[PDB]
């Protein structure tokens, strides 16, 4: 029969799941980009900072990873 | 001697409690959590604040998530102590919650009063009253800033914080109606109070700032939230009389898995009046003396636990023609239900029937799905209004099935239902999963 | 982005036109059109556990 | 703004947010077995009235049972202030029996003691509203009262009694109604002419389970961790104006015990756990010429004024040896419940917990009296030298003394709440331990 | 019946009951390590008396310790209404030292502030019962008071201090007793002739562990996430009748702080956080000819009437930048605790949380002041223009003003509750951060 | 399944007369799953004779 | 280090005296099994260490 | 002035010989016993 909710239901779950896959790739990519852009850890002053070079070298607190 | 003598007294009967132990009580390891911070940010109110006016506000995107919302009001007493009753609660006549243009929920001043009557308690309830009324015997002209917390699902738990961060294209708005009159502030019963000030108003939203890893997750992934909604139907009370027990069958146009129903009978003239007036202490203006009038409440003492002044003899809920439970007295719904289901104390005239084991919580614990019930009916039997309200002997020495002659003033009936729906948010937009 | 495509189809339309008020689950009569005139638009309930 | 806090991060924060496990801003709720709850009236077998003993069999009208409320309709035999929790007083005792085995048994005094220790705040007030007249009702007033039962299955759905899993056994509740209830059919020792007999009804809240859960209950064996009340009534060593009485009470208790609780009382006046006095609320007529320290202000029978409590100090011994240092009665009255429950306990009611949280369901330390041969409660009483009719003497006295009227508290009720296991197997059940 | 609800099943039930995960009708209890708890009296060194400092080392009787209660016997030096939480006032402070390191310290005012914010309902009333006289007791009355301590290990079993794992480090408590206690040895500034010196006793509740658990504690390292109280006193920029005072108070705090708390008081009168006035309970003699708005009704020192509070508004700046928008004093007095605690806070006491749920033990967001170079609390005071002796002026006034007597609230107490880590290893321990 | 459509012969060759006990009931309209009617312990047995004509599927 | 049950001493009584034999003659020993699921006793046999 | 009762409970015991002592302790037993069931009721009250 017409089944409005099964037809709309399926359309919704299709978009939703496709969107989830996109979003998951999205968060994975951002995490990978942070690790690549700032592939180091901090030091006692910059305790939880995310760093770009071997030494602190202007590390940040706005791009945390792991 | 000492505690070891107990510890050592161990045997087979202890195995169920301590054998092959799994846990301890003396090593709490706290769960590590994400970084966040919470800021209280003022929203700008659109429209025009004042008695009887409508205003609205759009919640700004200062943070990532929002939870608590507190509406501030400044009111000045239009009379002395005893003339007001939760006036800031009364002033916030209603509030609608809108997400992306869709109405998600709507509360009414009477709901705030009904909700409070059932779910707040002890010092929580008193502190609440301290934020909505004058409780230190303040006098005429006294000025106070009131704080009315909102009770939408996201205003009660961080777990349902609205992800403004995941609503990049949809706005979240609050639409408010301010009462045309507030008792003891700009009106005294039907009389206006000359010189009364218009209220000052401000809406505060508490915002959560998330760290990068969590913000990214929120911004990118879709979400769904299990949320609460309030349904409401207003109707006329089958007014009782000295000559009869009125009865009424109200078909409830309700939907969704409902946690509980709640209702009250009231005199719409006087905010919060759910019971009859009487010449017994606190039951009417001037009660206990010659000047007592059983046509006006002691506003500061509008609520009461004296069930003799309530109008419900008994009630049942019938579903599709079949009784859902046997008919029970009004006192079941007033005292027993909340004993079992909430743990607070409900004032006379306010009733609860839960379908949930624990209706006061967030976690579903049993629901009645009214979207699958063609005919959900609340069946009420009222008490006989034969008691002379001006005579304590009659008011206090009476029986189970009767009430005050002044109980016929409680002509309005407000029936509420709280249910669970799903709010879905994705790719910057959102709305509810179930229409009805 | 793609939000304008699922927002319009997010809400579900669960309707309960002619339901059984009894306690026993009714048998599933497949609503298959056999008559051109006076056709139904009830959309029978497909959510019905027996339980009895 | 909030961001300035968010970035304020250092080593001190690692323990709170490093390697995060949870959030607070996203809650997942659990899906649960579909069920419905209904309050169904039971048939009472026997004549209900004062002094009668009746019972009900809980008809199998659903799958599991939880809450039980006994309804009573009482009338006032006098004015406000003449009754004290009369519906609680009326239900003299309640016995829970499954398949013929006594599981538990409560007494009106237990309900009062339980309440004194474990209910609190508004729940306590509301409870009072369900068992008494608290809005200054007058003589002739009629009201329906609700006395909840407090058996293990009546406190949490988590211990719902699986009637569906008990096909071969009946579940019965026996109720003894008091011969007299103060302010309802008697005033002190005097009958009240014209007093009405109570109306009574028992309501049981049933759970209707979905097919899968109902099948599992019906077919599988079960083990429900439950509580039981042990109780022995006894004589209080009576103190006097000239002496501090002392008493060694053998505690014939068994099973893992969460706590002991006790009170001293005047058996004539329900709920009287303290001495009477001519201070406001402490006796009938207190504050005026007519004050009598032989009759309580019934509506104000309870009090927090320890000066009227009889116990001076106490200790519990296990196998003849001190279990803890002797503490003052006020420790057992105020601190024990502060430490372990979180409410306020009325004077004259005492608690000693063996459990971290005696008020909860989860076992948290018990004293297994089945492994202890000589458990003794050792009590020391205050000197009964204070003239109860004189506020100066009543209110200005010392720690070790009390009212001369404290010698009326000749009854002692000692309770012990313990764990046991209710086993259900193949349609029938009973207690794991004897 | 209930079955009519179960049959009403549809699409909207799937998100609640489809593929169910849990039930409510059967509780799984966890099996726990066997233990027992004993109350043991400590020996206290140094003379006990008003103004004296005494101390005790906790005896190694058990393995872990939790609750600690300080008992004090005080005698009323005047009639009812002359004292205010006198046992709390008496215990001026308590210092916790482990292995020679200061771990924490509480103050009588903190106990009052803490109570004002975090205790509630009957928990609070009973607390009052254990520290004051609340049944209109008269001069000469003697009472034993119990003051529970509020150190991290005194609040939850979860943080029981592992004396067992501290084989080489002692745990000591130092208790400072107040030089004077209102209504006991002094009445305002006047000494009470014949007043008794207090009797003191310190009790510690010991937890005895079974073999397996006891072994783990003695041998393994531990990291206990604990709370600490930071506290300093400040001079108040008191209000004037004609001008509005304001003040920038540097916050000398460090560590991940759950919340700040503060109050404005009259250091003369313990617990006075508000201005006095001729309204019921707001001053000695209020309501009559003798009303004196310079002397409090001590038994009613605390009030909820915000009109007598001094703070107009406040904000916290971090490194010179506003953390949150400026809010009124009533916001910090009523809303903050509404949101974060759920109790009722007395006028004059203010809370600002940096945490989602500061009332619990579980950390839920903190402000780490060790990373904030310049944190400041900015307070704006109400003008003290209202004639305290005239109820019309006291009760009919505006939001921005208070009683002239508010000028006497010269002391400001600012507290911060934070987290730290108490590390225990190889029989020794101390804090991870200083 | 198995239900009321079973006609059993009498236990003796003559005129019969049967009774009906039905002690513990089943008030709910839904037929409860039939229990085993075994004997777990030898102390508290019950003469309940588990009901027949009550099993859905 | 870490004394376990030899600190307070072994319990020479236990729960054997809950149904102790008052007669001078020794009572016969029972195998001490668990015949029924319900009413499982937790009382030790109380056997005389040296017969008269 | 009424006195409180003095009370004592006496039990008469049977002492068995050796063979029966063992048999009773070791063998299972089934004793046919009596029980009293009791319920109180209000009497419909008769009248003149």
From Swiss-Prot, chain A:
Alphabetized UniProt keyword annotations: Capsid protein, Late protein, Virion
**Is Zinc tagged as a keyword?**
no
Q: Give the GO cellular component terms, alphabetically.
A: viral capsid
Which cysteines in this chain are paired by disulphide bridges? none
Can you say where in the cell this protein is located?
Virion
What inducers act on this gene?
Expressed in the late phase of the viral replicative cycle.
Coiled-coil region(s): none
Q: What does this protein do?
A: One of the minor capsid proteins that constitute a network internal to the major capsid proteins and outside the lipid membrane. The minor capsid protein P13 does not serve a cross-linking function between neighboring capsomers, it may play a role in the viral capsid assembly.
What is known about its subunit structure?
Answer: Interacts with the major capsid protein.
User: Can you quote the domain comment?
Assistant: The hydrophobic region might anchor the protein in the underlying inner membrane.
Would you tell me the protein name for this molecule? Minor capsid protein P13
Q: Which organism is it from?
A: Paramecium bursaria Chlorella virus 1
Instruction: Identify the gene encoding this protein.
Output: A421R
UniProtKB/Swiss-Prot annotation, chain B:
Localization, UniProt: Virion
**What kind of modification does the protein receive after translation?**
Myristoylated at the C-terminus.
Tell me, using the record's free text, what induces this protein: Expressed in the late phase of the viral replicative cycle.
**GO MF terms held by the record:** lipid binding; structural molecule activity
Looking up Gene3D superfamilies in the UniProt record yields: Adenovirus Type 2 Hexon, domain 4, Major capsid protein Vp54
Q: Does the keyword Glycoprotein apply?
A: yes
List the residue ranges forming a coiled coil, or say none. Answer: none
Q: Which keywords has UniProt assigned to this entry?
A: Capsid protein, Glycoprotein, Late protein, Lipid-binding, Virion
GO annotation, cellular component aspect? viral capsid
Question: Does the UniProt entry include the keyword Flavoprotein?
Answer: no
Would you list which residues are glycosylated? Answer: 279, 301, 398, 405
Q: What does the record's miscellaneous section state? A: The viral capsid possesses up to five major capsid protein variants. They behave as asymmetric capsid components.
As for what it does, the entry says: Major capsid protein self-assembles to form an icosahedral capsid with a pseudo T=169 symmetry, about 190 nm in diameter, and consisting of 1680 major capsid proteins trimers. The capsid consists in 5040 copies of the major capsid protein (hexamers), 60 copies of the penton protein (pentamers) and 1800 minor capsid proteins of different types. The minor capsid proteins form a hexagonal network below the outer capsid shell, stabilizing the capsid by binding neighboring capsomers together.
Task: Give the family from UniProt.
Answer: Belongs to the NCLDV major capsid protein family.
What this protein is called in its record is Major capsid protein
The species this protein was found in: Paramecium bursaria Chlorella virus 1
UniProtKB/Swiss-Prot annotation, chain G:
A GO cellular component annotated for this chain's UniProt record is: viral capsid
Q: What induces it?
A: Expressed in the late phase of the viral replicative cycle.
- Record's keyword terms, sorted: Capsid protein, Late protein, Virion
Q: Where in the cell is it found?
A: Virion
Primary role? One of the minor capsid proteins that constitute a network internal to the major capsid proteins and outside the lipid membrane. The minor capsid proteins glue and stabilize the capsomers. the p11 zip protein binds together the neighboring symmetrons.
- Record comment regarding domains: The hydrophobic region might anchor the protein in the underlying inner membrane.
Q: How does it assemble?
A: Interacts with the major capsid protein.
Its name, as the record gives it, is: Minor capsid protein P11
Protein species of origin: Paramecium bursaria Chlorella virus 1 (PBCV-1)
Q: Which gene encodes it?
A: A352L
Range covered out of full length = 154 to 205 of 207
